[PDB]
C-alpha cells in the first residue's frame, strides 16, 4: 500500500500568529453546524476560513465532543453515514442497470466494510443495538 496523510506538528498549542478568540471558533463551528455541514467539512472550512490548525489545538477539545456539548450531535458517525450513502447510491445505480457486475462486486465490498464498522459500533455501544443495516 501507500502512505499519504497529514503530519500534525510537534507543538500542541495555538500557533501564536492567531489573532482571534476561542469562543468565536465555537460560534463559527456551531454556525456551520446549524447550516448543516458534516464535521470533516467543518474541519477543512475551519482550516481555511480563519487560521486554526484544528479544534483540539485551538479550542479545548475535538469537534465531536464540542458539538455534543453544544447539542448538535450526529445520530450516526461520519464514516458510518458516508458508507451507507455510498452503498445506497451504488445500489440505486445497479437497480437502474443490473448488468454492472463490477458494481455488484463493489456493493459486496462496501457491504462488508460497513458491516465491519457496524460490528465495531455495536460492540462499543455508541449507537443503540438492534442496528444491523436495515
Amino acid at each position: 500500500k501507500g502512505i499519504s496523510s497529514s503530519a500534525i506538528p510537534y507543538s500542541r498549542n495555538a500557533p501564536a500568529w492567531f489573532k482571534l478568540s476561542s469562543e468565536s471558533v465555537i460560534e463559527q463551528i456551531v454556525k456551520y453546524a446549524r447550516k448543516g455541514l458534516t464535521p470533516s467539512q467543518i474541519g477543512v472550512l475551519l482550516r481555511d476560513a480563519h487560521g486554526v490548525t484544528q479544534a483540539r489545538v485551538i479550542t479545548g477539545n475535538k469537534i465531536m465532543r464540542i458539538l455534543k456539548s453544544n447539542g448538535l450531535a450526529p445520530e450516526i458517525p461520519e464514516d458510518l453515514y458516508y458508507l451507507i450513502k455510498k452503498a445506497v447510491s451504488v445500489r440505486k445505480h445497479l437497480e437502474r442497470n443490473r448488468k454492472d457486475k463490477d458494481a455488484k462486486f463493489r456493493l459486496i465490498l462496501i457491504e462488508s466494510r460497513i458491516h465491519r464498522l457496524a460490528r465495531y459500533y455495536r460492540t462499543v455501544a455508541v449507537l443503540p443495538p438492534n442496528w444491523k443495516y436495515e
Partner: peptide, 22 residues
C-alpha cells in the same frame, strides 16, 4: 456550501416531525 439534509440528530428530528405532521 454542500450541507447535508440528513445525518444530524436535530435535522432528522425535524424530518420525522414533518412526517408526523403531514
Amino acid at each position: 456550501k454542500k450541507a447535508k439534509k440528513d445525518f444530524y440528530r436535530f435535522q432528522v428530528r425535524e424530518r420525522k416531525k414533518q412526517e408526523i405532521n403531514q
